[model samples]
Target: GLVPRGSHMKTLVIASLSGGQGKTTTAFFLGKLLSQSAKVLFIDADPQSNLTFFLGHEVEPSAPTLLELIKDMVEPADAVYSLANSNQFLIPSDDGLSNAQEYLASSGMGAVVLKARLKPLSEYFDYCIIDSPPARTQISIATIGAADQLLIPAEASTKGVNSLIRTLEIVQSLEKLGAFTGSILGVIPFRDKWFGLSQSKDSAGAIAAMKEVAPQLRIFPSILESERYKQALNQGILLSELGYPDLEKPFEGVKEALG
Candidate 1:
């Protein structure tokens, strides 16, 4: 009843068309957990570069960023950096990634350029987790277009449902161009609140809305809002390391689905 990543590599783009959907958290935590067993390539396509900082990579002003890579100024291999003492690699980004929008917008067939560049390097890593901007920008479009599988993280509130719809529309739009060939992995609930033993009304209802709208998709268990998560992130460690393996359940579920 379970499947593994097997020998083939996979690319999962954590994206949402609206902001604060926990895209970076999904990319960071999922990448961290998956790397415990497999090599992972983290690509921070968001110009905000939150994922880059979360991964502990301080981008140098002189080093080539995702902007340069997308602009064809740097080769794929040249843009990747290996994190110290880990199998995790990264193609970090910075605020300069915003410059890529005009370039991608102007280039014909720009939506598919990222896939073409990354295809040649697929064999190098077991998983490629990309964190895109939290909006419908060119970088986000191209980044999500490059996925072999799509993982959407949504907040457990009303706006989350709205964001989920817009995010799915992106896939629909890309499908019209025949530019996307991936399957949506599913939705992960973010900022889900649990008080004592009961769930918050907003969280509970929004989750129900998510199920109603996407009946065919798997709705992963909610990632409850807790200070434990913040503490772990601040230290750049996973829930398991903080003696809270239970909090890692949702991500572990995502990992199982990845296989």
Candidate 2:
């Protein structure tokens, strides 16, 4: 029989088939929200290391990157860094991570390394959020392999819709190969026209189009569109700990979907 547990470890992988669709912002919010209720760890898998920059910390030059964590480290306590927030922590990245793709291919474990690397640490936190790279590298694939849930932050546009479709295809293929065991948490429509630009025919058209094209991919009624959120992120603030408008509502929706 399964043992009684105090909490379940849920790992979230945030990514896009294309770049610049608010994946970083989404991942940040996930970490921020979950930190309120449980221990949260944010992993920066992007070579650009934007998460490290936004969080206002310097990742050491020779410190262990995800590659090393996978190959050498066995515990989350060893791999993660304590942030200013008591509930939140991070595994930051540097430019040196640019070699992650090449190294993973040569290593032959490829995308599944993250799953194996994080195996020992999964019980340490209530949630793990991974801000992934843009392309289909070992890191990206490995993130998929490790996730309990995948959140695709998509916008309302032809390009956005098309990109999600392609991502779904890739995920489906990987599932066939037994690489993914997680559910698609949802395809969140971020930066909608109402929040990004003023109301316009283009924005309305895009929203309507997205509803039709991907109806199964649940859409949230609340728009995560906030200039203040962008600003807070710029200043390295945690939205869940700070006073943001109805912030918990959307996150509650995310939790429900995951459940």
Candidate 3:
């Protein structure tokens, strides 16, 4: 049975079909925002370790990582790094996570390993946000299997819509097998200028298609185009740290919806 509501941690997985869809950024920002009211644990399940890098942390040679935790080299409590003077903690990832598939295959539990590992630590956190790999690999499956909610950030384009559909298909397949039971929190339409000026129109069409196909899902208010995001990425700072209160609105909306 799953953890009873209001009794244990609420785990959210930030996932997408491909790269550059804002999964890492969304996870980081949401973790930062949620930490204000509750203790948040950020898990970098992607081998790319972009989430780990975004938080300004590096995996040293002997430092414990998600890979080590999976291999049972360290306990969950020992693997977590307490962010300086904050309620947020992180279980950083490293390139070694690329070997996760092989390890999991040997264990014969496949995607359920993450859930098993996290079960013992649920009471320690109010929320756990996992940043998954972009591909439909073992890591992604494990992350989804471990989550109670899934948040997908997609660009406003045909490819983006297709990616979202593919992800939904995967989720449904998992649920059919009783491998996952998480709900889709929302599909966030992310507008990027590099995609072109017609992105607004494209986003509208995508939203309509999503509603037609998956009426049960929530389509979040679009994250509008903003150079501040790029600036923040370049400077290695949180969006809230940029001192732009308006930039925080979309994320705030997400938090409200989550509650």
Candidate 4:
């Protein structure tokens, strides 16, 4: 049985089909934003554990991994690290988690482990934001199963657009396996360098591809570009911390759309 229902419990899984698509960064931003008012928990399901590094936390080799969590060896309290954001907590990753795939394969329940582990934490927070590893792996499948909604971050390039399609195909497969039943709340296009790129051909092509594919997907209107985002991440700051007046526009737009 699942944990007792709580009005505050909601989960958002942020994932991508391929690597270097900025899945961790997206999760951090969303988790950071929502933590302003809601009790937010950011789960680092990725083995790379980049999210932990980004938040100034070191991956403790001796710490409990997701493997421990799945096997009933460790509780969520053992993994959670409270961030500087008062309302935010992190279910951090440990290097030992690299073996999670083998464990999942042995259990033949790869898509359900994460959901099962997180069930107990629902009573503690308003939202659970998942930072899924890039790829269509077992862990990614498990995260989708664990989430109530998903946010996909794809770049605005020819290959990036095609990768988005491939990701959707993987989701379809997961549905067939009874891994997830939630909706894709939104598709956010990242790194949209439409005009700044010297040639602009790739950006133009990307826009064209989006138009062709938009009808089939839940594409959001607020597209994100690279420059401002780079500045924010490079400085380890949030959009609100950046003090860029223009950043507020897209940030507000995303909040409105997501809400």
In model 4, where do residues sit more than 4 Å from their true spots?
A: 1-6, 196-201, 248-251
Q: TM-scores of the models, in the given order?
A: 0.94, 0.86, 0.90, 0.88
lDDT of each: 0.85, 0.74, 0.80, 0.73
Of 2 and 4, the candidate ahead on TM-score is: 4
Angstrom error at residue 187, model 1? 0.8
How do these models rank on lDDT, best leading?
Answer: 1, 3, 2, 4
Clashes of 3: 0
lDDT of 2: 0.74
| Best-performing candidate as measured by lDDT | 1
For candidate 4, write residues 1-259 as lDDT tens digits: 1233454568888878888546776777777777777788888888887777676676566777565775668886676777777787777776766677777768888888888888778787888888888887777788888878877777778777887788778887888888887778767766666554463677657756765775666666434565766667666678767877555454455455556
Tens digits of per-residue lDDT, candidate 1, 56-136, equal 899887998788889999888778888863678899998788988898889976678788778767767898999989888
Count steric clashes of candidate 2.
1
Which candidate has the top score in TM-score?
1
Steric collisions counted per model: 0, 1, 0, 0
Q: On a 0 to 100 scale, what is the lDDT of residue 233 in model 3?
A: 63
Instruction: Kindly give the stretch of ten consecutive residues in candidate 2 with the minimal lDDT sum.
Output: 1-10
For model 2, the superposed segments whose C-alpha errors exceed 4 Å read 1-7, 73-76, 195-198, 222-226, 239-249
Q: What's the C-alpha lDDT at position 29 in model 3?
A: 76
lDDT digits (tens) for residues 122-213 of candidate 2: 66777889999887777888888888888877666677777777788878887898888888877776665553346655546666666676
Q: Can you write out model 3's per-residue Cα lDDT over 202-246, one digit (the tens) per residue?
A: 667876776666688888876776777767766666677887767
